[PDB]
Design an enzyme around this catalytic site. Structure first.
Site: not given
Lengths: 277, 278
Positions: A140, A159, A181-182, A190
């Site tokens: 977890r 995002c 995501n671009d 990122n």
């Protein structure tokens, strides 16, 4: 494990198998006012064994900015654009609310004292760090920015909204997910950005580096970018640079922008892509 | 497609490349002798299905009627009350009920929390999703979340399959769900099929064709004591995928009842036993 290799693979895929959106997306090109169209693919993933920093060399990536935003979100845990402005960054002012914050988004979530640890309320980052040392085997180890009870109070939804960490054989593995995501602008920024976080966390917890996994839900590209993106796929790829992090830092909250330095970052050249507003 | 082929691939992957947690003090123990229940795992596993077949295991039987009953309780009824699940003839969650007979602020409670503003009215994740799928298709925010950070401590149990992302592209509705950890022998077959059914229910009430179904798993594992039977099951004869019939007359998500579901020609292998971990 080159990012160039996997980047190119996805980009090429999106171009020859992407799904176009036009009553779908309204995005006027901030340049000539004309509409911006995309091509998109679903569920893509890039995996890195951390034998090298996952970063682009066919195009320069703003590594320093990636780290400044990272620190603002994860370390300072703030939703205040002012703090980020004092860090010399202005790429978030367009979402600056009346009070200068971005609502109850990003850093705000990481800072909420909602976890009961040893008789006291602790935030998501603290709880994680503690549980990574004192309870490695846990299934977890999850940080969640997508808080359903406050989505309305967010000047913008994230995002990259989640991460899951795993300690398997003394190694720290990281899996992050981006709902959207671009590929041209946002992705490279990122991917590198979260690898740094892994390296930071692994150091303060004392684990060797495990695998880095980046999952993208809606993987899209703007049609206007396709030409250059195709030029980029032909550009030379160099060996990944070396990322230096201050080995002396033992406390997560003690890292500064000075403690990071990319070494020998050789790249392609200028190939900027227009931004759609 | 074929669940059996992909499943076996993951199972075999685990057996050959898995990493045990044998050196750690694990919270899981065997209900039989109390000894620590160790797992063997792989990280980040995904199974994709084009819906040309209902993804279901044939090498052994899958408790499909319970999968759907559980689904209705969590999603449709949005209940955290175990008594409601009992009235549906299910007692498997009884072990998790607190004094109040609820499993805390988990699962159905999250899905039924009226937290989204919609036309000057507060709706829950399910209502909001349904509206947005029809009214605002193409949004990149068709996401449900059971993992509420604020509620984590008030949950009798934390969810494995905790999120979903839907994608409407050219009429087709695509579904991608994620499990933080999934026991491949006991929970996986149940969970995968379960969510596909939810895809179909929603695609029917929103009038979309079925797109892809993607099931991602964070900590993909098998308990050490389950390996010999998993070995057996892999060598078993697989059967053609059955047909799932859903009442073609139901036009509303909340009108569904378990009777509207019926698997036709579901042929499967013999009973394989698997010790329960606690």
């Amino acid at each position: 494990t080159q990012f160039d290799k996997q980047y190119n693979s996805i980009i090429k895929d999106i171009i020859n198998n992407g799904i176009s959106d036009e009553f779908d997306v309204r995005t006027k090109w901030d340049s000539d006012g004309t509409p911006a169209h995309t091509l998109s693919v679903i569920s893509k993933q890039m995996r890195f064994d951390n034998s090298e920093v996952p970063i682009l060399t066919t195009k320069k990536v703003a590594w320093k900015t990636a780290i400044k935003e990272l620190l603002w979100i994860w370390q300072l845990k703030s939703n205040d654009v002012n703090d980020l402005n004092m860090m010399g960054v202005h790429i978030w002012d367009q979402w600056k609310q009346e009070d200068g914050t971005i609502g109850h988004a990003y850093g705000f979530q990481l800072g909420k004292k909602n976890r009961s640890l040893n008789g006291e309320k602790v935030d998501q980052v603290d709880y994680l760090l503690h549980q990574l040392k004192n309870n490695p085997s846990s299934r977890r180890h999850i940080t969640m920015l997508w808080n359903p009870d406050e989505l309305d109070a967010m000047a913008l939804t994230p995002c990259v909204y989640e991460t899951q960490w795993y300690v398997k054989h003394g190694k720290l593995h990281l899996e992050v997910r981006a709902r959207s995501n671009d590929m041209a602008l946002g992705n490279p920024f990122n991917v590198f950005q979260y690898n740094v976080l892994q390296r930071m966390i692994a150091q303060v917890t004392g684990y060797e580096l495990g695998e880095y996994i980046f999952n993208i839900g809606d993987c899209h590209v703007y049609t206007r970018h396709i030409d250059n993106l195709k030029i980029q796929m032909e550009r030379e790829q160099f060996e990944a640079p070396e990322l230096w992090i201050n080995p002396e830092v033992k406390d997560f909250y003690d890292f500064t922008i000075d403690d990071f330095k990319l070494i020998n970052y050789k790249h392609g050249d200028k190939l900027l892509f227009e931004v759609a507003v």
